[PDB]
Write a protein that binds this DNA or RNA. Structure first.
Ligand SMILES: [Br-]
Ligand SMILES: [Cl-]
Ligand SMILES: [Cl-]
Ligand SMILES: [Cl-]
Ligand SMILES: [Cl-]
Ligand SMILES: [Cl-]
Ligand SMILES: [Mg+2]
Ligand SMILES: [Mg+2]
Ligand SMILES: [Mg+2]
Length: 736
RNA sequence: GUAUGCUGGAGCAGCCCCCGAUUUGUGGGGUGAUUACAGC
């Protein structure tokens, strides 16, 4: 259980993880800070306060030195325990505690209730098993950390606790596909589109399978932006960065940083079109984006982009003649413009009615959904109620502090917070008191829904229109608003549809299907069609509309994938064989009985195994020597990668048991001012021939680093030396 | 394609509802604003 209890061969699971951390720190020395900041690039809200961010920026050498120390400690029989001590002082400990409390908050606030406690990373000034798992997570792919946590967790008795604890501890891991030698990003986009399309649409997964992976995210926009930029040099989409409780989202059109994220806000992007006399910039929604993709795929991209470019000219012409212009042109103009010219004004009475109906509706739905809502949703509602009853509104610090109480199921500390607001005369005794009779987030949430609905279902008074936001003093000149509007134009919904398919009776989905059937690809989605329709419910009920739209956008993504593959160098486009339901690629090695690997649609998440071609070649050659031609991924995993992993555990356990026997038999000691005995210095004191010591070191190094850089004869010699020193294992290697 | 505080503008965009509909509609109505916005 404690980290001290892992001695000799029991260290093996840590040996494998930490050697991979060093394997990966040799590919990229920046991984500690990269991993700590990965999520915070996507957050307006600071993951870290200012001094924590400062510590993180300085920490690479410290963290890289600790990574090497622990790898040394876990890769030796006996190493000084000093490396397992982090003082309260320690930069790395502060960083780790902040990153971990942030990951726990991120897990808890997406749950509907707080069920479990999380393990401590430290006990006194000593790292725990959970602390060691957390430290290594920063350097390794998800699959390495899952393998470590699976070996060392005491929590697997409770599946829910095991997986939530794992979620927190693995928050900062690398994606399984993090490292590649591929230089053509069209190769990686091809794989990413295929992986996403092979994930089952969430709603269909829950119906057919609810208790391939589940699709969790819609990546249509991301893919569409990469495809439109690759096809149309005139077009460039806004990239996001955050300038540093809250940072500033800045949108720019700099391409220089390949991996920089596109700006996507509520299914809107910013497009810059460089035609004629200079660039023009628009906001474009999903609706216009998906029609632009459809038009681009059919060869009308240049024409569509010309019509978007000219859009601003039409708006500027209409703006001078709003009173007299055709009512059909009112669609391009925001409310404030039409209302300034006496078009579609509403009586304050009507504005009150619509506003109060809406806010009433919002709170009746919250009241009905309390048990299904997330802790973050419930906490935000409770905080809105307290904030709207405060003499002076929460500052960011006050808000954050109370949010942390509510998300953490700390109802005592939340109620101590209300007491402090009461003693400060910020809220009156009634507001403090309505919470006195509650002990749970759900109870508090119901009380708040009831207080708000009581306020909203009063016979309309002056206090009510202020409460629902109709009381604000607008002091901005119409002419300032018009000027702002002209530098921030958004494309009217249905614009491209009306320009190209005016008299079409075919919806978006049928237009996509007609292009797929007649366009010349003869491809369709590889997922079973039942994943895009529930036959048992009506055409328009529940998820069926959303799944039907998903079939059309997946078909767009397949055609984008077709464009990317078709665009890559013929050397690479001609080796691969892509069917509706499979990808076949050649495996290196196995000369005489040459080989290919066949990924089914359910395996497209694993196409990253192609990034280490030498390892896949040796896995097939050494674990599957008799197989020739086409091999299923499933077979490569079960007979190859799983077989390798089983052997690797036995060789690492063997090597550590060897060190223990040879250090204690030959009664060995460390140098004065050294932490462990070099494995060289241990072999130097063996009864082995040179050829035996060479092979032992090479086979050891291979299993420590997860590769196959040795020959079958050299494993023979390793196996001989283990047998000669008492440590046998059922190697099951070499293979029949 | 997470509204973690407050002020003010913006709902052409995004999203929702009603109506229509082998489905995502330049039909109708909303959206106490999500922000290529300006401030505390
Ligand atoms: Br290899
Ligand atoms: Cl990553
Ligand atoms: Cl490449
Ligand atoms: Cl009121
Ligand atoms: Cl098999
Ligand atoms: Cl070799
Ligand atoms: Mg405001
Ligand atoms: Mg609107
Ligand atoms: Mg605002």
């Amino acid at each position: 259980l404690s980290i001290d209890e892992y001695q000799g061969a029991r260290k093996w699971c840590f040996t494998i993880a930490f050697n991979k951390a060093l394997v990966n720190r040799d590919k990229n020395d920046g991984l500690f800070v990269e991993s700590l900041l990965r999520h915070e690039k996507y957050s307006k809200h600071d993951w870290y306060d200012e001094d924590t961010r400062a510590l993180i920026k300085c920490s690479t050498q410290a963290a890289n030195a600790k990574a090497e120390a622990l790898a040394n400690y876990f890769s030796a029989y006996r190493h000084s325990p000093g490396c397992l001590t982090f003082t309260a002082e320690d930069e790395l400990r502060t960083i780790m505690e902040r990153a971990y409390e942030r990951a726990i908050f991120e897990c808890r606030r997406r749950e509907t209730e707080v069920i479990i406690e999380f393990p401590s990373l430290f006990e006194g000034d000593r790292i725990t098993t959970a602390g060691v798992v957390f430290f290594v997570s920063f350097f390794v792919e998800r699959r390495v950390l899952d393998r470590l946590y699976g070996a060392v967790s005491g929590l697997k008795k409770n599946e829910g606790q095991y997986k939530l604890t794992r979620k927190a501890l693995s928050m900062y891991c690398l994606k399984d596909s993090r490292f590649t030698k591929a230089w053509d990003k069209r190769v990686l986009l091809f794989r990413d589109i295929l992986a996403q399309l092979g994930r089952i649409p969430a709603e269909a997964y829950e119906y057919y399978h609810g208790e391939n992976p589940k699709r969790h995210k819609d990546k249509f926009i991301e893919f569409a932006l990469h495809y439109l930029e690759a096809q149309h040099s005139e077009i460039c989409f806004g990239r996001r960065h955050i300038v540093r409780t809250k940072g500033k989202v800045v949108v720019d059109f700099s391409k220089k940083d390949e991996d920089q994220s596109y700006y996507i806000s509520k299914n809107n992007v910013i497009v810059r079109i460089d035609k004629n006399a200079g660039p023009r910039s628009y906001r474009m929604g999903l609706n216009e984006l998906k029609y632009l993709v459809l038009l681009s795929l059919q060869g009308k991209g240049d024409d569509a982009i010309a019509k978007l470019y000219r859009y601003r000219q039409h708006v500027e012409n209409i703006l001078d003649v709003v009173k007299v212009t055709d009512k059909d042109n009112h669609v391009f103009l925001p409310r404030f413009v039409l209302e300034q010219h006496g078009i579609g004004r509403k009586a304050f009475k009507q504005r009150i009615d619509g506003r109060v109906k809406h806010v009433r509706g919002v709170w009746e739905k919250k009241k009905a959904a309390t048990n299904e809502m997330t802790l973050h949703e419930k906490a935000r509602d409770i905080l809105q109620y307290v904030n709207e009853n405060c003499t002076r509104s929460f500052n960011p610090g006050e808000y954050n502090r109370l949010l942390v109480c509510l998300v953490g199921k700390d109802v005592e500390n939340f109620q101590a917070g209300l007491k402090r607001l009461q003693l400060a005369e910020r809220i009156d005794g009634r507001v403090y008191s309505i919470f006195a009779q509650t002990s749970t987030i759900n109870e508090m949430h119901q009380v708040v829904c009831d207080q708000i609905l009581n306020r909203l279902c009063r016979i309309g008074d002056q206090k009510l229109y202020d409460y629902v936001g109709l009381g604000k003093k607008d002091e901005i000149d119409y002419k300032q608003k018009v000027a702002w509007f002209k530098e921030h134009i958004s494309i009217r919904r249905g614009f491209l549809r009306k320009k190209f398919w005016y008299d079409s009776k075919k919806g978006f989905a049928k237009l996509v299907e007609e292009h797929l059937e007649s366009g010349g690809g003869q491809r369709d989605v590889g997922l079973d069609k039942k994943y895009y329709h529930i036959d048992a419910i009506g055409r328009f009920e529940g998820a069926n509309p959303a799944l039907y739209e998903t079939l059309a956008r997946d078909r767009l993504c397949l055609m984008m994938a077709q464009y990317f593959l078709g665009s890559v160098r013929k050397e690479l486009g001609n080796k691969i064989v892509w069917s509706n339901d499979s990808i076949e690629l050649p495996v290196e090695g196995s000369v005489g009985n040459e080989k290919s690997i066949v990924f089914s649609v359910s395996d497209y998440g694993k196409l990253y195994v192609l990034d280490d071609a030498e390892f896949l070649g040796r896995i097939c050659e050494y674990f599957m020597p008799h197989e020739k031609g086409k091999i299923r991924y499933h077979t490569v995993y079960e007979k190859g990668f799983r077989a390798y992993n089983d052997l690797q555990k036995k060789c690492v356990e063997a090597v550590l048991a060897f060190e223990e026997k040879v250090v204690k038999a030959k009664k060995m000691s460390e140098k004065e001012g050294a932490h462990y005995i070099d494995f060289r210095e241990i072999l130097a004191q063996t009864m082995c021939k040179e050829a035996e010591k060479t092979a032992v070191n090479k086979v050891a190094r291979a299993f420590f680093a997860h590769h196959l850089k040795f020959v079958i004869d050299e494993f023979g010699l390793f196996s001989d030396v283990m047998k000669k020193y008492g440590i046998e294992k059922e190697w099951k290697f070499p293979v029949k």
